[PDB]
């Protein structure tokens, strides 16, 4: 099973490409029973190296594979509108990458196991903008959130909501210092105004 | 009855109309003080219109009753302070405006020579207080506007912020809480004018 050739039909899946020893090896294409079609490099019956897989619904990945999963630098385009360009780790967004959301949001930062995780900045379509840490695809740890007004909160976050100590600075110049828990003010706080009189 | 001048042993002088041996009618009296009164008299008392000029500088011009300021009258002070309003037997009482030399000027109610009731005070530092007063001090519900453009409205006690109140800024974002002796106390809530996501 050497040279070029065509083969398979596990279902109706036809692989056509290079071969070694009954394993697909080299560049080749494979239209799978789904209708998904991978066209790239192979290493011993798994996609390994660069390759493009078109999904039947519309999706389209472009990048490096390893052991039949996305691994390395790769671009995932949702022709609905989404677009991701960055590092992968065995099928999941992992490392650094940017994502353009359909709703208008844009992310730039770290990822771990297909989730925003680590440092990253997200420019919301509504005008807010977050610059801080993440955990499990939600704002977690210290961060800075600017609001389309121009005022901002800087403090701690937990599970996507304001939580812990924090300061909120106003355009006016005034400040409120207090503690949050699950996105809500409670406890003793301090509020400084810009002008005394 | 009639007119004539008199020199008391005190050094005081009176000349003007008399009735039954009592100063009554128009007359002028310069006191041993150096104070000189010039107005209407009734039975040896300032009563009706009159001016009283003090040797130190002050000058009352208005109506008198039972030898005391009573009715509408203007008093200008040592410092330059000018009161224009109603009097009640020597005390600011009713409605009156006081313009202090420091620049502040008050316009509101009075009771027993004290700011008491509703009144507006424009501070010289650019501020304005519109609220109630008790015993010459900001007391009750009031609105305090800062030159900032923000404003505090809530309650006052003995001249300081005290009780529930709201600071509302130029943005429309507001802080809601309670005060004790002009300083923040208790738990508060801060609301933003504009926020994320909604
Ligand atoms: Cl989040
Ligand atoms: Cl939140
Ligand atoms: Cl501003
Ligand atoms: Cl006061
Ligand atoms: Cl105060």
Numbering used by the authors:
A (entry chain B): 155 to 351
B (entry chain A): 156 to 353
List passages from the publication reporting this PDB structure:
High-resolution crystal structures and biophysical analyses of a truncated form of the TbMORN1 protein and its homologues from the parasites Toxoplasma gondii (TgMORN1) and Plasmodium falciparum (PfMORN1) enabled, for the first time, a structure-based definition of the MORN repeat. All three structures are antiparallel dimers joined via their C-termini, and, when possessed of the correct key residues, can adopt extended or V-shaped quaternary structures. The crystal structures confirmed that each 23-amino acid MORN repeat is composed of a β-hairpin followed by a 6-residue loop that connects to the next MORN repeat.
The structures of TgMORN1(7–15) and both P21 and C2 crystal forms of TbMORN1(7–15) were subsequently determined to 2.90, 2.35 and 2.53 Å resolution, respectively, with the PfMORN1(7–15) structure used as a search model for the molecular replacement. The two subunits in the TbMORN1(7–15) C2 crystal form and the TgMORN1(7–15) dimer make a rather straight assembly, while in the P21 form they display a bend of about 30°, leading to a rod-shaped particle appearance. The extended dimer interface is built from residues in MORN repeats 12–15, which connect the two subunits in an antiparallel, tail-to-tail orientation. Furthermore, the very negatively-charged C-terminal region of one TbMORN1 subunit forms an arch above the positively-charged platform contributed by Lys316 and Arg293. In the P21 and C2 TbMORN1(7–15) crystal forms, the dimer interfaces occupy surface areas of 747 Å2 and 966 Å2, respectively. Calculations of gain in solvation free energy (ΔiG) upon dimer formation for TbMORN1(7–15) C2 and P21 performed with the PDBePISA package yielded values of -20.1 kcal/mol and -11.3 kcal/mol, respectively, with corresponding p-values of interface specificity 0.01 and 0.08. ΔiG values lower than -10 to -15 kcal/mol and p-values lower than 0.5 are significant for stable protein dimers, indicating highly specific dimerisation interfaces.
